């Protein structure tokens, strides 16, 4: 009762059972989103409607429970914040999308309201602790890349300006505008058909075109290599920092073990 019911309900919501229970509900809902098919029985559609209604109310009480326990902190964990947004979107996608599309009719919404499906797939990241771990690890790498990504973007902009001015007059489908050139240089960076598809046709007209694209490949490959090396040595720095301190801690343990006796070894002379 009261705060004792809160103490009871917390020991449920934070339980390993409740964590696992919600994971299986997501998997079952994800499976039901695979069995749907435009070519299906009307009664199958009705049954799938009731089943999907059961899921949306069942995840709704989950959100309410999690809000009731975590309260002010719920709307600050990005994972809980994402799950809340997905529940809201999935309510709209089943009880107001008709009321939307019947007035703001647009052939985009038949494609945009898919987002209510995609969001419920992504809950399979948010609920699984091992998946939150890997995703937060991946996200934490991004800040260290920003300076080399900014450098690569500036090099791309410089080369896109030059490639538009050099080749865009006669190969506009590849370089005729800055946006054409950005796309074609990205293809070349991926090495996709870079010679047979782009540069050999260019050298029919621009014999020294190899002097542009081969140095370009070296630059972007070298920056990509150092981008990957940076991620390696950053992760290794996080490791080595621990190995280092653990050795120091044991050196300072040995400092304690010995010097606290070198203290005694002089008062032991007072006798």
């Amino acid at each position, epitope marked *: 009762r009261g705060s004792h019911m809160y103490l009871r309900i917390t020991n449920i919501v934070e339980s390993s059972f409740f964590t696992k229970f919600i994971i299986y509900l997501i998997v079952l809902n994800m499976v039901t989103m695979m069995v749907e098919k435009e070519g299906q029985s009307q009664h199958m559609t009705e049954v799938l409607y009731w089943i999907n209604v059961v899921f949306i109310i069942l995840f709704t009480i989950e959100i309410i429970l999690r809000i009731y326990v975590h309260r002010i902190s719920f709307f600050k964990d990005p994972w809980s914040l994402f799950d809340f947004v997905v529940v809201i979107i999935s309510i709209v996608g089943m009880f107001l999308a008709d009321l939307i599309e019947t007035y703001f009719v647009s052939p985009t919404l038949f494609r945009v309201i898919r987002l209510a499906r995609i969001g419920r797939i992504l809950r399979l990241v948010t609920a699984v602790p091992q998946m939150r771990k890997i995703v937060s690890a991946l996200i934490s790498v991004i800040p260290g890349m920003l300076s080399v990504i900014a450098l690569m973007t500036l090099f791309f902009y410089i080369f896109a300006i030059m490639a538009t001015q050099l080749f865009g007059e006669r*190969f506009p489908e590849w370089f005729g505008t800055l946006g054409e050139s950005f796309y074609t240089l990205f293809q070349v960076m991926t090495l996709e058909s870079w010679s047979m598809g782009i540069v050999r046709p260019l050298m029919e*007209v621009y014999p020294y075109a190899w002097v542009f694209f081969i140095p370009f490949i070296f630059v972007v490959t070298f920056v990509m290599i150092n981008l990957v090396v940076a991620i390696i040595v950053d992760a290794m720095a996080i490791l080595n920092q621990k190995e280092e301190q653990h050795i120091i801690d044991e050196v300072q343990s040995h400092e304690d073990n010995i010097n606290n006796e070198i203290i005694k070894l002089r008062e032991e002379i007072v006798e």
Partner: antibody
Amino acid sequence: EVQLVESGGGCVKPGGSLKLSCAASGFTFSNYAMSWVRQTPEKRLEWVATISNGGRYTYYPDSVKGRFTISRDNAKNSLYLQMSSLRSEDTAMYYCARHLYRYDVGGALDYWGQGTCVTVSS
Amino acid sequence: EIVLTQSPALMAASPGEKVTITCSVSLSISSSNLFWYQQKCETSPKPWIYGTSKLASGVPVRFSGSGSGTSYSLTISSMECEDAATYYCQQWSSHSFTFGGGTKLEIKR
């Protein structure tokens, strides 16, 4: 063989409108830019339109800007010239021509069709 | 945008004469960008020289082309009756093709 055959043409009234068609064979039509070239009765050659190999870029002289529109269908392997507000100036043989180099929207015209006549006359 | 002028407008060359026709350009252009066509009577033009000097496939090696900048020429080392035709120079720049007026070779049979 690489072959081009133009079609349409014939008589029109001044101010009239006409669509020329060119059928391509013996080469990958979608790899090449294509041009239309006039030959006027005094045998002066005059280029009138160019289209890129994907059709996304088109080029014209100011003699025909807004009056003409070059277009292509890379599946039909066909090239078109819509003409409008036709004038006695536009009385010419019109040749469909392939560019010498792939994707190049410039350079030279390595194969020319047989042509179709246009006679803008009252 | 760039005008090409050809001289002479008509030429009357003996069989076996060396023939030279000139194309003059109102601005300096790359020799890679000047081309020649041969048009026979009431047929479409055919490419004849690619750039200033590379003969097109099947052009008799008695033909040659030479020039740079604002002045270009096509030469026949020894004219034959099959050479009697109108020859057009052409350039490309900006996004326009322009053609010369043509030179009609009469062969004085």
